[PDB]
């Protein structure tokens, strides 16, 4: 389609996966603070993994002056 139109609940789980992480807790850890639904958790992990690796790549790039 793709009208993923993930339900609004799961959009929020993804969004929370994408918050800044100054305490440097792992995606998996943040999932243990509160007991989430299976669907929310999956979505939280996928988003959190995505942004974690995206910021690492961005930080690699900046250090090499290939960006920032």
From Swiss-Prot:
It is found in: Secreted. Mediator of local inflammatory process released following cleavage by C3 convertase. Acts by binding to its receptor, C3AR1, activating G protein-coupled receptor signaling, promoting the phosphorylation, ARRB2-mediated internalization and endocytosis of C3AR1. C3a anaphylatoxin stimulates the activation of immune cells such as mast cells and basophilic leukocytes to release inflammation agents, such as cytokines, chemokines and histamine, which promote inflammation development. It comes from the Eukaryota. The record marks 64-65 as: (Microbial infection) Cleavage. C3a is further processed by carboxypeptidases to release the C-terminal arginine residue generating the acylation stimulating protein (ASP). Levels of ASP are increased in adipocytes in the postprandial period and by insulin and dietary chylomicrons. The record marks 67-68 as: Cleavage. The chain holds residues 681 to 748 of 1663 of the full protein. Residues 13-48 form the Anaphylatoxin-like domain. This is C3a anaphylatoxin. Disulfide bonds join 13-40, 14-47, 27-48. The gene is C3.
């Amino acid at each position: 389609d793709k009208v993923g139109k993930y339900p609004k609940e799961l959009r929020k789980c993804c969004e929370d996966g994408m918050r800044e992480n100054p305490m440097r807790f792992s995606c998996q850890r943040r999932t243990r603070f509160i007991s989430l639904g299976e669907a929310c958790k999956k979505v939280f992990l996928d988003c959190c993994n995505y942004i974690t690796e995206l910021r690492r790549q961005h930080a690699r790039a900046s250090h090499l002056g290939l960006a920032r």
